[PDB]
């Protein structure tokens, strides 16, 4: 019945590096999806297997936000079933999951003059990743985020909301 901690996940000072993407468990909260949807900052709110406006009426059993910084061009990979270096070796979404991916350009914040290198992605791995796991030449490459990089190179803060629609006990509900 109390409001839901969406702000902390979305407005976190520093996101996690994709190679070790973060995951928060959201529960016992009345999630208000309208505020997120109507916000214009998000370039892409693509919902798979659910209708974005319908979201505010459903109830969910477990919902997780996965948050991490990547380059602008790789965001297309976050779509399920797309094969690439970032998908295969860093973060790969189960085939036909039911979730919504939200992204926004964060070049206002994450980019630093002279480059910010705190963000890493895995350069080498022996085999492709299984759904929703994380792994921890030298195999980690730093991103060179400079404030005047190209749009593809600019960092995009991506939050993936993954939620199961089956009618088990539901602790996260909308109005």
């Amino acid at each position, epitope marked *: 019945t109390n409001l839901c*901690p969406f*702000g*902390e996940v979305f*407005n*976190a*000072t*520093r996101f996690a590096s994709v190679y070790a993407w973060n995951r928060k468990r959201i529960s016992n909260c009345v999630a208000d999806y309208s505020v997120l949807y109507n916000s214009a900052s998000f370039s892409t709110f693509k919902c798979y297997g659910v209708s974005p406006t319908k979201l505010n009426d459903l109830c969910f059993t477990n919902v997780y936000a996965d948050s991490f910084v990547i380059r602008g061009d790789e965001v297309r990979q976050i779509a399920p079933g797309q094969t690439g270096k970032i998908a295969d070796y860093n973060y790969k979404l189960p085939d036909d999951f039911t979730g919504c991916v939200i992204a926004w350009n964060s*070049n*206002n*914040l994450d*980019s*630093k*003059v*002279g480059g*910010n290198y*705190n963000y890493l992605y895995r350069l080498f791995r022996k085999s492709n990743l299984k759904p929703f796991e994380r792994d921890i030449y030298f195999p980690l490459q730093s991103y060179g985020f400079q*404030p005047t990089n190209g749009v593809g190179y600019q960092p995009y803060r991506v939050v993936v909301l993954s939620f199961e629609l089956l009618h088990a006990p539901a602790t996260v509900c909308g109005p």
Partner: antibody
Amino acid sequence: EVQLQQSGAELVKPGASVKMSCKASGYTFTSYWITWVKQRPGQGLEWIGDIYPGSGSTKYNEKFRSEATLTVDTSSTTAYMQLSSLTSEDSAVYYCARWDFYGSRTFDYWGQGTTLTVSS
Amino acid sequence: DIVLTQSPAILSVSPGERVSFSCRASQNIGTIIHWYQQRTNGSPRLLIKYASESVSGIPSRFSGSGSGTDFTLSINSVESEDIADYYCQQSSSWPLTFGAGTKLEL
């Protein structure tokens, strides 16, 4: 050496806005954010808002989204906080601070303490 | 918004006693907490970085501990040189929130 120094002390009648400044020195200005904090006689510190010198982004405490507006002259490396109007409750002591967003995320360098006498 | 409750507002103490403080956040912060001290008339200054380990420059007598949600600070002994208020602060997510502050006194 890195140190921040407050513009000084100002006295004004109510309604008379104050635009005040903390003088930055001794470090690469773009590298470390600037953050403004506020306090009043008899209670502890409260955050006002943040600004990024290298891109001019700003953040605010919701209670002061309207009264305060933050700007920077990244050439001379000095940041400014503008207050639109003043009440006799607003009589307060203000500190300008350094925020190390990309490293420690600490307010490890501060000003000498600006005083605002709002007085009718 | 995380609200950072810190008390007792006055921690009356006799010098030589070990003292302890504690910060309780209103949500999981992780470990991004700091403490600041304010001597009489003075500005605040950073003491503990990431709530457990002393910043490079402060005496080793100041030690932090705790993680996740319950953060605490203890000073091995308080002399009148350390008479000051201490404020909790968090920097994990916006908006940033300072504590109420606690007072040492005889």
